[PDB]
Amino acid sequence: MLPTAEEVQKLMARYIELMDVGDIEAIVQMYADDATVEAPFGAPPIHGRERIAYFYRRMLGGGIARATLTGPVRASHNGTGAMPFRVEYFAMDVRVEMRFDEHGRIQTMQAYWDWV
C-alpha cells in the first residue's frame, strides 16, 4: 500500500520540477489534507493544506528563478525519501525529508536550510 522506493524517487523528482518553475498549486496538490511542514526544521510547524499554501505562496509567490538538485534523491522502502537542492530568486541550500501516505501524498516534510 505505501509508495515503493521508485515511486518515492519520481514523487520527489516531481517536487523539484514544480519548485523550479514556481508551480504553487501543483506543489500544494502533492500534500495530504492534514499534512505538516517543518521548514525550516526548528521553526513553528505548519499544519494543513491552507497554511502550507501560505508557505509556498511566501516561498514562490513573488516568483522564483530556479530550483535544482545538488545530489541523489534517496528513497526508503518505508515510503520516505530525502534530497538536497539549492533555490534561486538570491540563493538558499535545502535538505528535505518527506514521508508519503499510501495515496502517494506528502504526510510530513522537514526542510533543513543553509544560507548561500
Residue numbers in the entry: 0 to 88, 95 to 121
Task: Give the authors' words.
As proof‐of‐concept, we designed protein binders to target three distinct epitopes on two different oncogenic targets; vascular endothelial growth factor (VEGF) and interleukin‐7 receptor‐α (IL‐7Rα). We selected eight of the best‐scoring Sam designs (Sam0.1 – Sam0.8) for experimental validation.
Analytical size‐exclusion chromatography revealed that Sam0.7 is monomeric, while Sima3.2 exists in monomeric, dimeric, and tetrameric forms. Sam0.7 and Sima3.2 have similar melting temperatures, 63 °C and 65 °C, respectively. Analysis of the kinetics across the injection dilution series, assuming 1:1 binding, resulted in dissociation constants (Kd ) of 190 and 14 nM for Sam0.7 and Sima3.2, respectively. We obtained crystal structures for the unbound Sam0.2 and Sam0.7 proteins. While the designed coordinates of Sam were derived from its complex with VEGF (MD‐relaxed structure, Experimental section), the crystal structures represent isolated Sam monomers.
